Design a protein around this ligand. Structure first.
Ligand SMILES: [Ca+2]
Ligand SMILES: [Mg+2]
Ligand SMILES: [Mg+2]
Length: 432
DNA sequence: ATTATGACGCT
DNA sequence: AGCGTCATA
């Protein structure tokens, strides 16, 4: 009744760049624009591994993780851009720098949480209050929402044959129902949130050339889900009211954090398929199976309610460099291990020095991780040491010292079992 | 032989 | 601390 919170206190958006690495390459090379395009890394093994795919290429069935030689079988005219290689390894600087361009624009509108290289959550609650005061009871025109979908609409009762017409019919029903006379209507707040996101998205495109999609809702999980409902180059508003129908057929794995083993457990243990089916369990029941924290989270989430705050953090918390040495390329000599630790340390030194200059901070811990031939785990071993100076030779020497005792080989010069992954990561930043 | 990342939870 | 999970291009 009157005491049951509804998770409608905030307006949160999730902005996600469309096929991000591809757009970065298309901006740089106009010949790639409006074409089936993919970004690949390395080239010698099966034409390289695809890591980003334009919407034109996806129509042919090209996906991430596909080998470019295989993608070419589906899409013979596929164009490719290759990730830059430096010091013998893929170097993602160009995309990191493009990400900064976008993140800096978003930060003009509101506080953001950098969630990945190409997406950020936005807390719009304050911005919405401000805009509502400016509007002074003024209705919101559909003209202010030119790329917005309202999830769940239109409903009930011939232009609806095409997608743009459906989008507009839905928007009109939504706005027709809105009560603009009340500065505290959650639905109104979401709508104004959407007006602001249109503006943010226009600014991103104007100032970078990059297009993005976005979700607008009352929390991060619904915002993220919403964003994916209409891509590319569109934004989606998911209201509290839309949740029961949306979740009624929504596979559990689609919700963020339930895409892996926990999500699988939920389905297996409870014998359900859809997020909405969770409402029939008590909070205690969910806690008994999935733990106190997850059980409480699931109980609220299946009702559209989540409280995780948009953290004020625009910069990454760690800076790392990693390389796999698959199959026959695994490092089997000490000279090999040392040469590559050095290559990695040199890239890391370069990124750290630039980070210190731009952002007034210094990393204080170096984390060293390796994988050994045979183990099916990301990392086999992880060891930290102190990071006291931005010097590549020192860092690589320290990394070797910390891992040297993993070498089974009774021989000094040989390395066994061979190493199939090296990883250096600078962490634990402090102001400088 | 997807690879190169990056955040956060557990004990 | 070191390990595991989940997620990004
Ligand atoms: Ca994206
Ligand atoms: Mg993304
Ligand atoms: Mg993606």
């Amino acid at each position: 009744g009157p005491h049951m919170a509804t998770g409608q206190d905030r307006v949160v958006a999730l902005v996600d760049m469309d096929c991000f690495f591809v757009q970065v390459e298309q901006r740089q090379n106009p010949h790639l624009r409006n074409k089936p395009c993919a970004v690949v890394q390395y080239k010698s093994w099966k034409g390289g591994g695809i890591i980003a795919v334009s919407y034109e290429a996806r129509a042919f069935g090209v996906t991430r993780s596909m080998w470019a030689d295989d993608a070419k079988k589906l899409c013979p005219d596929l164009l490719l851009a290759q990730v830059r290689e430096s010091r013998g390894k893929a170097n993602l600087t160009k995309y990191r720098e493009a990400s900064v361009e976008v993140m800096e624009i978003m930060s003009r509108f509101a506080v953001i949480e950098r969630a990945s290289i190409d997406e950020a959550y936005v807390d719009l609650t304050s911005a919405v209050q401000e805009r509502l005061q400016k509007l002074q009871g003024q209705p919101i025109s559909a003209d202010l929402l030119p790329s917005t979908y309202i999830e769940g609409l239109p409903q009930g009762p011939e232009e609806t044959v095409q997608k743009e017409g459906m989008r507009k019919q839905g928007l009109f029903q939504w706005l027709d129902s809105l009560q603009i006379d009340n500065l505290t209507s959650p639905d109104l707040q979401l709508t104004v949130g959407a007006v602001i996101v249109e503006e943010m998205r226009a600014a991103i495109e104007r100032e970078t050339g990059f297009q993005c999609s976005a979700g607008i809702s009352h929390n991060k999980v619904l915002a993220k889900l919403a964003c994916g409902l209409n891509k590319p180059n569109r934004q989606t508003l998911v209201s509290h009211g839309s949740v029961p129908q949306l979740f009624s057929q929504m596979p559990i794995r689609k919700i963020r954090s339930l895409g892996g083993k926990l999500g699988a457990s939920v389905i297996e243990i409870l014998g359900i398929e859809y997020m909405g089916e969770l409402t029939q369990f008590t909070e205690s029941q969910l806690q008994s199976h999935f733990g106190e924290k997850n059980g409480s989270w699931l109980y609220a989430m299946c009702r559209g309610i989540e409280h995780d705050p948009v953290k004020p953090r625009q910069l990454p918390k760690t800076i790392g460099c990693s390389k796999n040495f698959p199959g026959k390329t695994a490092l089997a000599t000490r000279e090999q291990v040392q040469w590559w630790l050095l290559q990695l340390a040199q890239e890391l030194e370069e990124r750290l020095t630039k980070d210190r200059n731009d952002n007034d901070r210094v990393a204080t811990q170096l984390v060293v991780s390796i994988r050994v031939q045979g183990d099916k785990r990301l990392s086999s071993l992880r060891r930290c040491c102190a990071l006291t100076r931005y010097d590549a030779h020192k860092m690589s020497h320290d990394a070797f010292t910390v891992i040297k005792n993993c070498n089974t080989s009774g021989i000094q010069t040989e390395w066994s079992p061979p190493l199939t992954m090296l990883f250096l990561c600078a962490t634990k930043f402090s102001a400088s």
